Structure formats: structure tokens, C-alpha cells
Amino acid sequence: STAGKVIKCKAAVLWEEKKPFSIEEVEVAPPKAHEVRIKMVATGICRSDDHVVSGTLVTPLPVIAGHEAAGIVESIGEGVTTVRPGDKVIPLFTPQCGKCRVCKHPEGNFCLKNDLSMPRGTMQDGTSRFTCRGKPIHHFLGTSTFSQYTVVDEISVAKIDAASPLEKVCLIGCGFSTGYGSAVKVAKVTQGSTCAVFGLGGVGLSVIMGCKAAGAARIIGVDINKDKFAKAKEVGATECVNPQDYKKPIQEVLTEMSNGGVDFSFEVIGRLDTMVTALSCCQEAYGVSVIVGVPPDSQNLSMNPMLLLSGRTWKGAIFGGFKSKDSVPKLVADFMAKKFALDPLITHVLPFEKINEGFDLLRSGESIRTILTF
């Protein structure tokens, strides 16, 4: 029906930095070899999408952003074996080629085919599948989910359970997996341990979820906005701390609370000060601190290497350390097995055409997560 031909549909185009998204009629070309064309069903609004708007995540413009989504396969290009028309799917902003030294490494997941390190804003073949009135439009992280239809490389898509609620599991595309994996995969939280989570937005709640899944005995949420405490406790926080409530530095408060430091700490916020606070507040001999995000325009931080010499470990990761094509279907199956809940993370749902209102919600701090529906 549409296979093999151009699809005319709507997409949200960002023509220039620091502008609202423009809803436009675009033409989406059919998939070439080893490409997959997908009809979007739902897409989440992530901070990283806002970083494109601000000019802080530098990627070629004009662009179709969006990287956290789920949809249904409309058609497949020549030689595609891992998905078929009609399959439910989640685009992978961190690809899993299976061939490169990172994909072949037991602990690596940042596949060398990614479009994040040096963004080209294209398909793997160096071209674009999008045009708006004959003007080419860039891809974003090989996903481009702010469109009714997108085309992705086979290495950037994963087949998921056909019974999945796509309006919920789209979170596995970025925010949930990123926080959850940071606990379960990167830190490797252990049973009965004490965890501290700095930032109680959607990613921080996902870290709490992971700490709970791993059986942490204490999970201390830290945030200056006390209206985030209720949800943090719902999803597994055992106590919450507001640093503004105190006369002493937060790392001291946490060190005293945990009888000499936490087992695992997580910095979600992206703030250089809490990155060092989170490191300092873990036990000096065996503590592990994980950086879950860094704003793309971050300056250097200043820290004393003596924090590490005692035996601390400091690490970061993309996409929760998950090998993406392997892990996403497993995470969906975990959701389908009722291992964890996704509803507490969803605070707003809007039709796709209201994408700008959704970004206002993001920017004001009012939403944990907004899902856009097609």
C-alpha cells in the first residue's frame, strides 16, 4: 500500500535554534537496504530534545528531533531480518551494530556507529530520508521520532512484545532505561545496600526503581524541590532529603545518615556541584558513584583526586549501560511480566500537535514526563 513509495505526513521540524517546533508536511522516503520505516505511536519529550533547541546539544539543523519512542513497522528495506511489517518496535538512539569493538566488549554499549559523538544528522549512509518542500531535513541520533513516520537503520531498532502498550513502553527508549540501568547495570546495586539519588525527576525516579529492583535496603532521594518527595517514595525511596533544610553541607548530612558513607550514589541533575557531592558522600573505601547525565555544554568540574585514592570508583554511562538491541526487548518483557511500573513516571499526555505545550511543561519543571500520542 505505502511500501516502496514516498509517504507525505506531518512532522515537528526545528528550522533553527531557539525557535518553537514547526508542524510541517514532510515527505518521508522509502527505506533503502537495511533500513526500516516506522509509523510512530507515541514519543516522550526528553531534556536532551530541549538541548537541541537551546543549541547546547550541537547537531545539524534543520532537524526532526525526538529519540524516545515506540511505533509499528510500516515497511522494511532489502535484507532486513530482525523486524517485519506490523511488528511493535522501539528506535535505539544508541545503536547495537554487533560488529565493532565496543559491541564485542562484555561491558561496552556505546557502539561506534552512534551519531552522538560527532553528529552528522543522517542515516548510516550519509543521507537523509526527510524533505520539507524539497528542502532536506536532518535526522537526530538515527531516530527522529517527532514525526508520524520515520526511517531508521536496522541497527537502531528493536522488536518488542506485540502485546505492549506503546504509550507506556516508549519510556524504555530513553528515560526509564537510562536511570534503571544506571542502578542495575552500571553501579550494580547489591541487596541490602544504601543508595543516594541526587535529582528526583523522571530519570532519578527510574534510578530509584532500579535500586529497589536490586534490593537496596535504604534509598535516599535528594532534591531541593520537596514536591518531588511524594512520588520518589511511591517508587521506592525510603527517605528524602532537601539540602535547603540544612545548615551543614549535604555530603556531611549524608555521610552521618549512612554511618560513614553510602554504598552507591547517583548524580542525575547534571550539575557540577552535586557530581562532586555525590562522589564524596559514598563510602571512601568501596563506594561507587555514577554520573547518569551531563549537560552537553558542561564546563569542567573541580575535584580533589584524594576522593578516589581511598578506594572510590567513579563512572558514567549512556543508556544505562545497556547494549540496546539486546536489552530493550528484555526490559519490555520485564514490564509485561509486571516486574516494574511505568505509570508513576507519566504525568502528562498530549496529542503530537501540541508538542510545544509539552516542551513548556518540560521547561517549567511541571511534568515528570509528557508522552505525545499520534
Q: Please, what is the minimum distance in Å from the beta carbon of residue 182 to Zn ion?
A: 13
- The answer to whether the CB of 102 falls within 8 A of the CB of 178 is no
What DSSP assignment string belongs to 126-163?
S--SEEETTEEEB-STTT--SBSEEEEEGGGEEE--TT
Beta carbon nearer to a copy of itself, 210 or 293:
293
Give 1 or 300: the residue with its C-beta nearer to a copy of itself. Answer: 300
- Based on the residue annotation, tell me whether 156 is a catalytic residue of this protein: no
Instruction: Please tell me the distance from the alpha carbon of residue 42 to that of residue 166, in angstroms, as a whole number.
Output: 6
Size of the site for Zn ion (CB under 5 A): 7
Classify the phi-psi angles of 134: left when phi > 0, otherwise alpha if psi is within -120 to 50, otherwise beta. left
Respond yes or no: is residue 132 known to be catalytic.
no
Active-site residue (options: 9, 34, 51, 177): 51
Question: What residues from 45 to 104 belong to the interface with Zn ion (CB under 5 A)?
Answer: 46, 48, 97, 100, 103
Out of 9, 48, 193, 282, which one is annotated catalytic? 48
Do the annotations mark residue 222 as ligand-binding?
no
174 binds Zn ion (CB under 5 A): yes
Q: Which of 283, 267, 286, 265 is nearest to 275 (CA)?
A: 267
Choosing among Zn ion, a copy of itself, none, which partner's interface includes residue 174 (Cβ < 5 to 8 Å by kind)? Zn ion
Three-class SS of residue 79?
A: coil
Minimum Å gap between C-beta 139 and a copy of itself is 21
Catalytic residue from among 67, 139, 147, 280: 67
* Amino acid identity, position 185: K
Closer of 180 and 359 to a copy of itself (Cβ): 180
- Cβ–Cβ < 8 Å for 248, 235: no
Closest C-alpha among 150, 117, 144, 116 to residue 27: 150
Contacts of Zn ion in 109-138 (CB under 5 A): 111
Alpha-carbon distance of 46 to 23, in angstroms, equals: 18
Q: How far is the CB of 288 from Zn ion (least distance, A)?
A: 20
The response to whether 211 counts as a known ligand-binding position is no
* Grid cell listed for 261: 558513607
Q: How far apart are CA 374 and CA 352, in angstroms?
A: 6
The answer to whether 51 is a known catalytic residue is yes
Is 265 marked active-site?
no
Residues that bind Zn ion in the complex, under the rule CB under 5 A:
46, 48, 97, 100, 103, 111, 174
Active-site residue list: 46, 48, 51, 67, 174
- Binding site as annotated, residues for NAD(+): 48, 199-204, 223, 228, 292-294, 319, 369
